[PDB]
Amino acid sequence: IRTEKIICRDVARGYENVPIPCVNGVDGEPCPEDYKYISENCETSTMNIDRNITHLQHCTCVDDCSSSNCLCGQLSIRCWYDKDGRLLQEFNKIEPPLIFECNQACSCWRNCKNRVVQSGIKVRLQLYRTAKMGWGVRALQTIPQGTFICEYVGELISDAEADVREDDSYLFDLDNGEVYCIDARYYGNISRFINHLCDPNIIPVRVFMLHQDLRFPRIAFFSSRDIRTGEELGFDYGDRFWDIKSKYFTCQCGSEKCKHSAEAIALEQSRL
Amino acid sequence: TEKIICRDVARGYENVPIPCVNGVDGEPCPEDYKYISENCETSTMNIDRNITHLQHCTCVDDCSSSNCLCGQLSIRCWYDKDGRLLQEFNKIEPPLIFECNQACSCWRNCKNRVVQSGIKVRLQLYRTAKMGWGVRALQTIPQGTFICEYVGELISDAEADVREDDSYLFDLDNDGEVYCIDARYYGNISRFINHLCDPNIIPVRVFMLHQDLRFPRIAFFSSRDIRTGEELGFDYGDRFWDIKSKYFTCQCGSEKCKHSAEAIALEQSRL
Ligand SMILES: CNc1cc(C)nc(Nc2ccc(OC)c(OCCCN3CCCC3)c2)n1
Ligand SMILES: CNc1cc(C)nc(Nc2ccc(OC)c(OCCCN3CCCC3)c2)n1
Ligand SMILES: C[S@@+](CC[C@H](N)C(=O)[O-])C[C@H]1O[C@@H](n2cnc3c(N)ncnc32)[C@H](O)[C@@H]1O
Ligand SMILES: C[S@@+](CC[C@H](N)C(=O)[O-])C[C@H]1O[C@@H](n2cnc3c(N)ncnc32)[C@H](O)[C@@H]1O
Numbered sequence A: 001i002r003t004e005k006i007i008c009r010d011v012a013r014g015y016e017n018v019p020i021p022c023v024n025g026v027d028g029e030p031c032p033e034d035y036k037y038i039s040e041n042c043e044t045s046t047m048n049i050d051r052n053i054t055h056l057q058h059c060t061c062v063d064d065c066s067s068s069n070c071l072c073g074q075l076s077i078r079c080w081y082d083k084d085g086r087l088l089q090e091f092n093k094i095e096p097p098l099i100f101e102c103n104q105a106c107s108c109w110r111n112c113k114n115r116v117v118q119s120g121i122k123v124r125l126q127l128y129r130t131a132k133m134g135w136g137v138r139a140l141q142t143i144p145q146g147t148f149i150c151e152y153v154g155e156l157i158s159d160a161e162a163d164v165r166e167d168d169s170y171l172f173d174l175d176n177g178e179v180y181c182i183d184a185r186y187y188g189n190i191s192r193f194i195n196h197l198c199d200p201n202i203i204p205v206r207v208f209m210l211h212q213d214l215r216f217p218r219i220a221f222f223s224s225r226d227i228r229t230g231e232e233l234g235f236d237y238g239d240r241f242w243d244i245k246s247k248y249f250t251c252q253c254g255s256e257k258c259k260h261s262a263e264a265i266a267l268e269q270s271r272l
Numbered sequence B: 001t002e003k004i005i006c007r008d009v010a011r012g013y014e015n016v017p018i019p020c021v022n023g024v025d026g027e028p029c030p031e032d033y034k035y036i037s038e039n040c041e042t043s044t045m046n047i048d049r050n051i052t053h054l055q056h057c058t059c060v061d062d063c064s065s066s067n068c069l070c071g072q073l074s075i076r077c078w079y080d081k082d083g084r085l086l087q088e089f090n091k092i093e094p095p096l097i098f099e100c101n102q103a104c105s106c107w108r109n110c111k112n113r114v115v116q117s118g119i120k121v122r123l124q125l126y127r128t129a130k131m132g133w134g135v136r137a138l139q140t141i142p143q144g145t146f147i148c149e150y151v152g153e154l155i156s157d158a159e160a161d162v163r164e165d166d167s168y169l170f171d172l173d174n175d176g177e178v179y180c181i182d183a184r185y186y187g188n189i190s191r192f193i194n195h196l197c198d199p200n201i202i203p204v205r206v207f208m209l210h211q212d213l214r215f216p217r218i219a220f221f222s223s224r225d226i227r228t229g230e231e232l233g234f235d236y237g238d239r240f241w242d243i244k245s246k247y248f249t250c251q252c253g254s255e256k257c258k259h260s261a262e263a264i265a266l267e268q269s270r271l
């Protein structure tokens, strides 16, 4: 009875390396427009990010930064990107290390091997209307394990500002006393529409590029396994989110392994 | 003879490569500076990057209409449909340009985004006969075309005041309390552009991703048609020549030259 309609040829309005279309084959919900699409983190009130170019640790490489003498690699133990820009198979997917990409202070060229996240989105993604979870994001192509997908982009806000945001649905915690969040509620990119999955296929990794202010890592999603075409993308939102939200709604991810469904929570409340 | 001694002085940081040739002498490709493609800071400048402070448009076309708010913040959008300054653009007294930004409703490829889109023309760093390194066009360039930005280290008046080398400074005209770009230590292709008494490019103040009026970004546009091989240059202005004249004199070689040893002698000797 109902057709899949294409309702936006590019929700990023041309701001990404590729267009991100939106389709809806499920209901009458038109293209989401209660937010401003931005491709890189914004600020409302000042974050006082340390941008002093002299504070950048940087490499003195004269090659494409594949030697273990690259200081940038060394700051993360080693450079973790293979030759096609994908995380090495031994990459710690459980506790990813901080990645330091090469920056404007490095001697190397813009096209060295240590610049994956800064080069932006390469895989083809689609915003689509899911059965039970509002909008979601899926792959239009297969994506090998360890490939960079997109960054979690938003408005940088302080601990205190987060405390009083009305909607807490789109917060990402920036990990390291004085702490900050990304809030994608009013300003965000394609990643604000990525759903929680109890069986995730992407992991967030903290990355530094043009600054190395440790209060403000940038959050890069990489696939944690090969992803088949058409699969929904999803990461583990984590307990902070679910401890709060569990009483308003439960997880609809549909996995055998789901630990946040109405069923999982009732089995748990009773196993206690 | 004239050999290519760097394939790209910008190390792939620009949209296009900028080669270095030397057919005049034995000087190697300059390297006493760090090539950057965007302005940098050393000491903190606190640029206002509050997205809510951005004046922005509500267009859902390509921003060609006179109703584009961003266009009006400079009387009119000054760019034709090919991204060139209008013929009637005030080349003597250029107004402030406000390009579209991340707060505008429009698309990234609207018509009000010329400078933020980067270098498009083919430029070359070459060795000149008499003024060290210079920059020249490797193609014809019509009047009103964006060439490159003057990129460097943002610094205060006080800091400029104590800089040993004052050869690479650009004043950011502003209200109260003023800043400079110093391209001495950190710079892009434009640090190599020489002064000409018969100039073929002009600097324009432009705002893009922020609108902190202390820190306009400086875009060079051609002020007439330029032929392949022509040296680019602008008028450095009296402030530079006043300081510099007692050290060296203008070698631009134009009959209009007003800063040569000769021209300076004829004025001292009208006194
Ligand atoms: C309240 N004051 C604060 C203050 C600080 C520093 N952090 C937080 N974090 C936080 C609060 C509520 C959350 O959930 C309702 C939450 O979820 C993070 C994981 C789920 N996100 C959803 C999309 C991006 C990832 C984080 N809240
Ligand atoms: C000393 N304290 C200052 C302080 C401030 C606010 N401005 C300046 N400006 C300045 C000083 C010396 C200069 O020249 C010797 C000069 O040249 C302006 C134009 C020449 N530039 C050369 C490359 C780009 C254009 C500007 N100096
Ligand atoms: C970051 S937004 C994800 C995009 C969201 N689907 C939308 O339509 O905007 C997070 C919100 O999506 C919904 N959501 C995400 N993952 C879910 C899940 N596994 N089960 C149920 N609802 C989920 C909840 O409304 C949650 O607060
Ligand atoms: C911003 S740099 C331009 C690049 C410089 N030619 C170089 O080789 O690095 C300015 C300096 O270039 C030289 N210069 C530029 N225009 C000149 C001119 N018209 N006559 C003589 N020297 C000039 C002077 O040394 C001046 O202080």
Ligand SMILES: [Zn+2]
Residues within 6 Å of the ligand: A059, A060, A061, A064, A065, A070, A071, A072, A073, A102, A106, A108
């Ligand atoms: Zn390196």
Ligand SMILES: [Zn+2]
Residues within 6 Å of the ligand: A059, A061, A064, A065, A102, A103, A106, A108, A109, A112, A113, A114
């Ligand atoms: Zn590198």
Ligand SMILES: [Zn+2]
Residues within 6 Å of the ligand: A058, A059, A060, A065, A070, A071, A072, A101, A102, A103, A106, A107, A108, A114
């Ligand atoms: Zn490096």
Ligand SMILES: [Zn+2]
Residues within 6 Å of the ligand: A197, A198, A199, A251, A252, A253, A254, A255, A257, A258, A259, A260, A261
């Ligand atoms: Zn689940």
Ligand SMILES: [Zn+2]
Residues within 6 Å of the ligand: B057, B058, B059, B062, B063, B068, B069, B070, B071, B100, B104, B106, B112
């Ligand atoms: Zn507009």
Ligand SMILES: [Zn+2]
Residues within 6 Å of the ligand: B056, B057, B058, B063, B070, B099, B100, B101, B104, B105, B106, B112
């Ligand atoms: Zn605009």
Ligand SMILES: [Zn+2]
Residues within 6 Å of the ligand: B057, B059, B062, B063, B100, B101, B104, B106, B107, B110, B111, B112
């Ligand atoms: Zn526009």
Ligand SMILES: [Zn+2]
Residues within 6 Å of the ligand: B196, B197, B198, B250, B251, B252, B253, B254, B256, B257, B258, B259, B260
């Ligand atoms: Zn002259």
